[PDB]
Design a protein around this ligand. Structure first.
Ligand SMILES: [K+]
Ligand SMILES: [K+]
Ligand SMILES: [K+]
Ligand SMILES: [K+]
Ligand SMILES: [K+]
Ligand SMILES: [K+]
Ligand SMILES: [K+]
Ligand SMILES: [K+]
Ligand SMILES: [K+]
Ligand SMILES: [K+]
Ligand SMILES: [K+]
Ligand SMILES: [K+]
Ligand SMILES: [K+]
Ligand SMILES: [K+]
Ligand SMILES: [K+]
Ligand SMILES: [K+]
Ligand SMILES: [K+]
Ligand SMILES: [K+]
Ligand SMILES: [K+]
Ligand SMILES: [K+]
Ligand SMILES: [K+]
Ligand SMILES: [K+]
Ligand SMILES: [K+]
Ligand SMILES: [K+]
Ligand SMILES: [K+]
Ligand SMILES: [K+]
Ligand SMILES: [K+]
Ligand SMILES: [Mg+2]
Ligand SMILES: [Mg+2]
Ligand SMILES: [Mg+2]
Ligand SMILES: [Mg+2]
Ligand SMILES: [Mg+2]
Ligand SMILES: [Mg+2]
Ligand SMILES: [Mg+2]
Ligand SMILES: [Mg+2]
Ligand SMILES: [Mg+2]
Ligand SMILES: [Mg+2]
Ligand SMILES: [Mg+2]
Ligand SMILES: [Mg+2]
Ligand SMILES: [Mg+2]
Ligand SMILES: [Mg+2]
Ligand SMILES: [Mg+2]
Ligand SMILES: [Mg+2]
Ligand SMILES: [Mg+2]
Ligand SMILES: [Mg+2]
Ligand SMILES: [Mg+2]
Ligand SMILES: [Mg+2]
Ligand SMILES: [Mg+2]
Ligand SMILES: [Mg+2]
Ligand SMILES: [Mg+2]
Ligand SMILES: [Mg+2]
Ligand SMILES: [Mg+2]
Ligand SMILES: [Mg+2]
Ligand SMILES: [Mg+2]
Ligand SMILES: [Mg+2]
Ligand SMILES: [Mg+2]
Ligand SMILES: [Mg+2]
Ligand SMILES: [Mg+2]
Ligand SMILES: [Mg+2]
Ligand SMILES: [Mg+2]
Ligand SMILES: [Mg+2]
Ligand SMILES: [Mg+2]
Ligand SMILES: [Mg+2]
Ligand SMILES: [Mg+2]
Ligand SMILES: [Mg+2]
Ligand SMILES: [Mg+2]
Ligand SMILES: [Mg+2]
Ligand SMILES: [Mg+2]
Ligand SMILES: [Mg+2]
Ligand SMILES: [Mg+2]
Ligand SMILES: [Mg+2]
Lengths: 183, 52
RNA sequence: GCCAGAACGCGACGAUACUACCCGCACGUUGUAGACGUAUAAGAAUAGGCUCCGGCCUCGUAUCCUAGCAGGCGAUUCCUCCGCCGGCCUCGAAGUGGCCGUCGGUAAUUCGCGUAUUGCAAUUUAGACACGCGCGGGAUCAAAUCCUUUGCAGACGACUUAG
RNA sequence: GUCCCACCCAUACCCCGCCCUCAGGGUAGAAACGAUGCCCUGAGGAGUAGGCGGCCGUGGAGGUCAGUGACGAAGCCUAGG
RNA sequence: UUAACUGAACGUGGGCAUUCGAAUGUAUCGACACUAGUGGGCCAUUUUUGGUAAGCAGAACUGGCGAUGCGGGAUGAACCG
RNA sequence: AGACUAAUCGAACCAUCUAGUAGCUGGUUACCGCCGAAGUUUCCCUCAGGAUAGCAGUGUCGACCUUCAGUUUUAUGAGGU
RNA sequence: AGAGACCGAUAGCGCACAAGUAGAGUGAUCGAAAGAUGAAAAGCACUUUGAAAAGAGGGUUAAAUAGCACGUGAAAUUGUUGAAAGGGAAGCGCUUGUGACCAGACUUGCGCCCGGCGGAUCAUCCGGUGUUCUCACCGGUGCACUCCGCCGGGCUCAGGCCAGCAUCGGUUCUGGCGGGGGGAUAAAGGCCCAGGGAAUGUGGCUCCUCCGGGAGUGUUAUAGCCCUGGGUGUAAUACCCUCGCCGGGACCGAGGACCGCGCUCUGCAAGGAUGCUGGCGUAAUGGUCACCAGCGACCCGUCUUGAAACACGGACCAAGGAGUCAAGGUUUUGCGCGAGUGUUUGGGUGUAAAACCCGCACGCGUAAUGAAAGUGAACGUAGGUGAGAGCUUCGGCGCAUCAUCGA
């Protein structure tokens, strides 16, 4: 006997994509080579985010990009391993260059109409094989309707599972002091 | 590919400790004590020993 | 004393056809809880014994036998040791030993010829009992069951009887 | 009752081989690779109720082997591989 | 708040490894999501309640059997290894 | 006599509602690999049953965060066996 | 009337057949089993045995191993033949033995030299055509020391099964020998020097017995013993610790060009076994089965704290036999589009239940909060502080997310 608390412990993180996209497999082969033959920490981060599922790759809009193009980042290259969407609230688009996994049709048209350019993640590896003069951006992970229901309980202020909204749907006993108690 | 044991294989011992050959050649494990006529127990160490 | 009698315990006796039996020879188509010098007889005491009558005993750490082509062929030499037969005695706990005779073999001494080639190891195929087969000689000419019958017996078999 | 030597054997301990599981590395100016492959290194392996992974079989459907077959398809028997 | 810029909380600027201020390990850090089975237990050293007592009935800390083979106790769920 | 009403009577026989309901007994079909329990808390016309917390598996994500610990040491509190 | 990713005779309707039939009940009502010779009956003429049913011959057929008890013809259970075991169950696990039966492997291969035989045309150059643009193919030349094939002879190397010896590597068991250190620098002890004692009193002296002896007396004499110092002496030996050197056995050989650390450095025992030799080339090694032998081995499924249980189900075999489908929720994986998204209620069209095309409404989402009348999201570069991957002109900028103060 050896008296060990743990044995045959498996890793907690993904080691390959779960998708079967043929072109995503070509992209993964490229960045496996780059991460092994370069010392840049940038390349290792991009490889890991290519394994992730869609709820771990939330979208990023043009407004969120414009917020981070201030205070001396006007001429860096924006890198987003996700979809880039359009924002109707933003009326004037600044000029920029962005490398993204994919663009929506209107997002791509507004970037180029302001004098910018759009790249693919394989075009980025050819121009910046070490990730120099770049900024990495992520979208909001918790801005999902399902996360509002997590951890429901007393004195937690979370969202309940109900079939409708109105006065007759879970508002009487346990929600106000005029009927028993409150939460 | 195969661990070999010094204290049985002399070539391995010389690889790890180049002073081994000198130690054996000069017989450093058989050094004699310094000369000198020794005194005797001072006649009261012996009295206490058999005291009771 | 009295009842049963091991259905895988034993003894004595009678008659034994069928080569079933006996003797001799030669083979293996064979089996064996396991040959390889398968060598050794006093009785008794243990705080006492043995003896050749001189002595001797912790001790079988003994005694016998033991050489030669897996053991040849001759000589020199010796009168020892071994075996198959035959004749007399002897042996009863589950039957054994001794004496004598003919015949065959035989380094206690010393030699002459032969050994190879199984190739640098491979069980040293070797003993003793059983059994089978084939010859050549001797000896021998028997019973049991069914069946019929009895009632000293009996569910049926079996049993006591007669033909 | 107390003390002292030598010896016997567990799936336990030590060394070696092989299987699997987990972990960590190498491999493109490609004389290059079932890159889902190959090469190097270390540790681990008991299990009911229960959870997950990978694989083997059966009846039908699309595609493909320009597949087998009356010179013998399918089925059945076989101390033969 | 105090008679009172006197205090109370939160700070700018500056100084201090010439040593970030016991030992050992790190053979397994943090946070989240979804769900299975279970909800009759029993045994033992020490401590303990009722009972004359019980292979009786009831508790505390820890270790076991249940869910588990192997070497010992001839046998022997729980004892020794 | 709760007796008899076609071997049927303390409420006949036949078809349908009907696959009537069961906190209760019985069964529930190939292989290998890795991890691995509970009989305890609170509430219930609750005591052979449920919900709820714990114990277990699987999927991940954040950094590979000087990060932790069924342990010792040093200083300093509480307790009525 | 047309069809199907439906079932294939214990299935599919109760019924693929003279099936709502045969049969049961007074009656209302209940209600089965049962498909397949061969292409064609060519469905066995004649002889013989038997009372007959039938048998034996002889015919038909591609086949009677298809004869109306009819395609194929499994298991439970039974007969004959063959092999084997058995002293109050049998069956099973590990490991030898005997008997029977059996799959592989091996039979040669490449190379060099010598001779014979046959055929070409080997190298080079000229013309044409391809192609990876320098590499090839076809036609012509070549014409015996070149090229190709066969046969004969010799030589090296590699090759199948089981074993023996020598030199090494890894692990381990077990004998023997040479040194060093320590303690009261072992303690004792032998020999020598000086002092002091006694008795289980040596020799002498006395008494008792001659009957072997005994009893007194006293300090080394004709034996000896015990204490205390000193010398040889740093004596020896035991015990504990430690540095090396020689023998004897057992099990194992993973890896496959070189590369490294080293040494006793023409080389080697240094990042894992080679060299030499014999027998046999097949049932010899090896495998399957049956049986005897040594050791081991309680009947499965299930409920249970506890099952081999005097706890329940199970005589045997074949075929059937149990977490499914729909609507509505939820979390997680893959995919399309993305502030939007969803053609298919319907219309157009068609090679016609397919595939293709169209867009008015509508659903979910884009805004909340109150019982309701109602009202309705920027002081600031969409705020300040502490952490924070990544980038950086090295001054800093700071995603996601967490804690905190505000709007
Ligand atoms: K009220
Ligand atoms: K001779
Ligand atoms: K299938
Ligand atoms: K003030
Ligand atoms: K639960
Ligand atoms: K529960
Ligand atoms: K109970
Ligand atoms: K009890
Ligand atoms: K036991
Ligand atoms: K009736
Ligand atoms: K109940
Ligand atoms: K007290
Ligand atoms: K039927
Ligand atoms: K009738
Ligand atoms: K035919
Ligand atoms: K015929
Ligand atoms: K047939
Ligand atoms: K040794
Ligand atoms: K000494
Ligand atoms: K002395
Ligand atoms: K005297
Ligand atoms: K290895
Ligand atoms: K049961
Ligand atoms: K039973
Ligand atoms: K989904
Ligand atoms: K809409
Ligand atoms: K940073
Ligand atoms: Mg282990
Ligand atoms: Mg008898
Ligand atoms: Mg396991
Ligand atoms: Mg089907
Ligand atoms: Mg066939
Ligand atoms: Mg069979
Ligand atoms: Mg229960
Ligand atoms: Mg109790
Ligand atoms: Mg009880
Ligand atoms: Mg249980
Ligand atoms: Mg246990
Ligand atoms: Mg045991
Ligand atoms: Mg006992
Ligand atoms: Mg009646
Ligand atoms: Mg049902
Ligand atoms: Mg019912
Ligand atoms: Mg485990
Ligand atoms: Mg109630
Ligand atoms: Mg029950
Ligand atoms: Mg972090
Ligand atoms: Mg980590
Ligand atoms: Mg108290
Ligand atoms: Mg139809
Ligand atoms: Mg039928
Ligand atoms: Mg039917
Ligand atoms: Mg039929
Ligand atoms: Mg006939
Ligand atoms: Mg046929
Ligand atoms: Mg029949
Ligand atoms: Mg038939
Ligand atoms: Mg049969
Ligand atoms: Mg048997
Ligand atoms: Mg030519
Ligand atoms: Mg060795
Ligand atoms: Mg001395
Ligand atoms: Mg000395
Ligand atoms: Mg090898
Ligand atoms: Mg040979
Ligand atoms: Mg054999
Ligand atoms: Mg047994
Ligand atoms: Mg019992
Ligand atoms: Mg029951
Ligand atoms: Mg029964
Ligand atoms: Mg069927």
């Amino acid at each position: 006997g050896i008296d060990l608390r743990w044995k045959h412990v498996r890793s907690s993180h993904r080691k390959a994509p779960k998708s079967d996209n043929v072109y995503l497999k070509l992209l993964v082969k490229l960045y496996r080579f780059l991460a092994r033959r370069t010392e840049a920490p940038f390349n290792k981060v991009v490889l890991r985010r290519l394994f992730m599922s869609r709820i771990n790759r939330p979208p990023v809009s043009l407004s969120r990009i414009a917020r981070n193009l201030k205070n001396g980042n006007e001429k860096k290259t924006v890198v987003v391993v996700a979809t880039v969407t359009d924002d109707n609230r933003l009326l004037q688009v600044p000029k920029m260059e962005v490398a993204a996994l994919r663009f929506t049709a209107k997002a791509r048209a507004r970037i180029e109409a302001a004098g910018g350019r759009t790249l693919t993640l394989d075009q980025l590896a050819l121009e910046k094989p070490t990730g120099a003069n770049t900024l990495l951006l992520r979208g909001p992970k918790n801005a999902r309707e399902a996360v509002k229901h997590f951890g429901f309980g007393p004195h937690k202020h979370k969202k309940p599972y109900v079939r409708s909204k109105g006065r007759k749907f879970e508002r009487a006993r346990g929600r106000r002091r005029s009927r028993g108690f409150k939460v | 590919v195969q661990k070999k044991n010094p204290l049985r294989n002399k070539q391995i011992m010389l690889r790890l400790n180049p002073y081994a050959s000198t130690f054996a050649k000069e017989k450093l494990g058989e050094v004699k004590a310094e000369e000198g006529k020794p005194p005797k127990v001072p006649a009261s160490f012996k009295e206490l020993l058999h005291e009771a």
